[PDB]
């Protein structure tokens, strides 16, 4: 075929990670971590950091931002929470060449959080990607579940 | 190959099964510990059998001297499938008693009972004892508490072929553990805790009994985890 026949090489997923960018931190890391926790219902990871050139003053070593990785059918539930309502705010389809579907919705107010638990404006990421090469092939998994495409 | 003059890697390493770090600090002793699946006295997880042997001096590596087999359990009186808890304990006890060879009776013949020879025994110190004894090898996967490897170690130890041990990383007899997805039936070691879960019920995907690893079997041949199945092997050997 194109090695794609069975349910595996269709796609059983690995991880569908949620992230929130923390370009603030300090006191306000407790915003990002508690927002992840409120949507999923899971313990967030206060993250590692890659070894690159020392921007600002500190980059690596310090546990700077926060994400939460989730695998299995447990990942498909938190996927639906971002897809079925939060995609139909302000979002059209994003895909790279490899085919990474990100989310970035400044409406934190619709699903999960309100403006009451927040500090100010912000969005949150959902890297709801697919482990099968090329954006022709990743877009197959999302179109069988039918997402909001810009044609 | 790569840059400069360079060595391409070993075939069995690339093949993704043979390890070499485990092959360093393990083999040095050369007392009674070998098996054809991996090396040293291995208790594997399989769909069915394990072979279990001891050492023999040959040029290429170790050969069979004494040994048993897991399908040398319907020898006594198990007649079901190929897959549970009780078989791991039973096959460990079987090889320990079978210091003859696979075609044989449950007697000594070769020389060994525990190891090759006897040796000293002081009082207990840690770190550096004189460990001239049998390694019951894990082989591959995680050393989880309650596992079949350590259940087989219990049968092996005072059964004959003596591997020492504490009671930390181990299962028991009464309490093994054990996870469940829903259908309906049970098997076990003796009876234990799975028959206590039988107030709510639902347990099964993957056959039963005779040889190593997988479970209970759903169809009504014996609905409760009774002692009569296991004791037909255990008291008979």
């Amino acid at each position: 075929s194109t090695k794609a026949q069975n349910p595996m090489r269709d796609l059983k997923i690995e991880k569908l990670v949620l992230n929130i960018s923390v370009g603030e931190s300090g006191d306000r890391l407790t915003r990002a971590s508690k927002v992840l926790e409120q949507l999923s219902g899971q313990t967030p990871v206060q993250s590692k950091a890659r070894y690159t050139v020392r921007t600002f003053g500190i980059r690596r070593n310090e546990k700077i931002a926060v994400h939460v990785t989730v695998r299995g059918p447990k990942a498909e539930e938190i996927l639906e929470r971002g897809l079925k309502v939060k995609e139909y705010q302000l979002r059209d389809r994003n895909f790279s060449a490899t085919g990474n579907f990100g989310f970035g919705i400044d409406e934190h107010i619709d699903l999960g959080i309100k403006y009451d638990p927040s500090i100010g404006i912000f969005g949150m990421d959902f890297y709801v990607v697919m482990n099968r090469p090329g954006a022709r092939v990743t877009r197959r998994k999302r179109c069988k579940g039918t997402v909001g495409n810009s044609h | 190959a790569y840059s400069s003059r360079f060595q391409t890697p070993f075939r069995r390493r690339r093949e993704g099964k043979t390890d070499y770090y485990q092959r360093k600090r393990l083999v040095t002793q050369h007392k009674a510990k070998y098996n054809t699946p991996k090396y040293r006295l291995v208790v594997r997880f399989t769909n069915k059998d394990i072979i279990c042997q001891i050492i023999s001096s040959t040029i290429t590596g170790d050969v069979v001297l004494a040994a048993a087999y897991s399908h040398e359990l319907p020898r006594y009186g198990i007649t079901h499938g190929l897959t549970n808890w009780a078989a791991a304990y039973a096959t460990g006890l079987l090889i320990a008693r079978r210091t003859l060879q696979r075609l044989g009776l449950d007697e000594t013949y070769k020389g060994v009972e525990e190891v090759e020879g006897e040796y000293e025994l002081t009082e207990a110190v840690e770190d550096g004892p004189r460990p001239f004894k049998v390694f019951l090898d894990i082989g591959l996967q995680r050393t989880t508490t309650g596992a079949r490897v350590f259940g087989a170690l219990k049968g092996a130890s005072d059964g004959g072929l003596y591997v020492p041990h504490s009671e930390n990383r181990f299962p028991g007899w009464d309490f093994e553990t054990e996870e469940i997805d829903p259908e309906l039936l049970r098997s076990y070691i003796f009876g234990g805790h799975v028959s206590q879960y039988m107030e709510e019920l639902a347990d099964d995907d993957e056959e039963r009994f005779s040889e190593l690893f997988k479970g209970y079997l759903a169809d009504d041949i014996d609905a409760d985890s009774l002692e009569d199945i296991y004791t037909s092997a255990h008291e008979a050997i």
């Binding site: - | 400069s4 360079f6 060595q7 070993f10 360093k24």
Partner: protein
């Protein structure tokens, strides 16, 4: 000019090999000797405690015996002063294997008289 000790002059005799780099396999590791086994020598910075000396590589040798067990064993070789009993200590990995061909000459010769 130079200082002595480790890598000076014969850097190769300290060194591993570019082709055979990386951790040493279980070849000469598990091959322990006894009386009258002819052997060779070449070191590396892979085996830390019990590394042989660099000046006393180059030379071949024979194993006297393995004394007690495996480690602390010896290889006989002359040093270029004059003929004297000199050896060298090391552990097992550095020791190799060579010419066990020559001594089999006597057993080949003894098939003589019965051809009458």
């Amino acid at each position: 000019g130079k200082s002595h000790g480790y890598r000076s002059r014969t850097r190769y005799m300290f060194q591993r090999d570019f082709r055979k780099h990386g951790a040493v396999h279980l070849s000469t590791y598990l091959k322990v000797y006894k009386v009258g086994d002819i052997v060779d020598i070449k070191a590396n910075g892979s085996i830390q405690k019990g590394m042989p000396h660099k000046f006393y590589q180059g030379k071949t040798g024979v194993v006297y015996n393995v004394t007690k067990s495996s480690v602390g064993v010896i290889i006989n070789k002359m040093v270029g002063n004059r003929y004297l009993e000199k050896r060298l200590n090391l552990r097992v990995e550095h020791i190799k294997h060579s010419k066990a061909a020559a001594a089999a000459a006597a057993a080949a010769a003894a098939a003589a008289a019965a051809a009458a």
